[PDB]
Amino acid sequence: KVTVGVIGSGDFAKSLTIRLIRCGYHVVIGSRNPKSASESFPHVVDVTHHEDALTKTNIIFVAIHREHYTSLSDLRHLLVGKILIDVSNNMRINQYPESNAEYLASLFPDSLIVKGFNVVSAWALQLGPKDASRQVYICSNNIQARQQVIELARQLNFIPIDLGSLSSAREIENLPLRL
Ligand SMILES: NC(=O)C1=CN([C@@H]2O[C@H](COP(=O)(O)OP(=O)(O)OC[C@H]3O[C@@H](n4cnc5c(N)ncnc54)[C@H](OP(=O)(O)O)[C@@H]3O)[C@@H](O)[C@H]2O)C=CC1
């Protein structure tokens, strides 16, 4: 089984982990408190500290909020070359001078940041997306990483919508707030 990483242990990390397992992946979780977080996951999931989880996979969902990204900054060297999937949303349209994905890319300039899955609710990961809204919008400045995340979306039974460069991340982040 291919191993996919998730940082964080909240509602989104838990739902993502469900879908990943159902779709045939092995999951490693990076948590600040893995002994405590382990009870929030099945035994088949490897729950560990961030620095250990990162050694087990090259593709990591960053299932934490933007305001906590800098808690990972000391992992910069270990994260070099890895794909980081920015799943985040904000409470306001155009909330910051840069999109959350661009902010993450600036914190980890030698990682490969891909925006994706922010439009998917926790409940949609558990039940599946509505038949008329299986779309997940994906973008990245790195074409190879973009294509890997597109293929992951397909394996998770979503319809990936390739919006090209990371410049698309801003309006992808605005989309849940628009109607
Ligand atoms: N909930 C949803 O339905 C959806 C959420 N998202 C996005 O997913 C991401 C997570 O959302 P959600 O699960 O609801 O968020 P939570 O508020 O549950 O936070 C998730 C994780 O953040 C981690 N973390 C929290 N504080 C810190 C910190 N100070 N430093 C380092 N890590 C920290 C915790 O992990 P730990 O304690 O294990 O370290 C926690 O389990 C967000 O970006 C959200 O916008 C996207 C679409 C849907």
Curated annotation (Swiss-Prot):
GO MF term (any one): metal ion binding
Residues noted as binding NADP(+) in the record, renumbered to the chain: 9-12, 31-32, 64-71, 89, 122
Keywords: Cell membrane, Copper, Electron transport, Endosome, FAD, Flavoprotein, Heme, Ion transport, Iron, Iron transport, Membrane, Metal-binding, NAD, NADP, Oxidoreductase, Phosphoprotein, Transmembrane, Transmembrane helix, Transport
Presence of the UniProt keyword Transmembrane in the record: yes
Gene Ontology terms: cellular component: cytosol; early endosome; endosome; endosome membrane; Golgi membrane; plasma membrane; trans-Golgi network transport vesicle
A biological-process GO annotation: response to hormone
Cell location: Endosome membrane; Cell membrane
Similarity remark: Belongs to the STEAP family.
Protein's name in the database: Metalloreductase STEAP2
The species this protein was found in: Homo sapiens (Human)
Residues of the full protein shown: 30 to 208 of 490
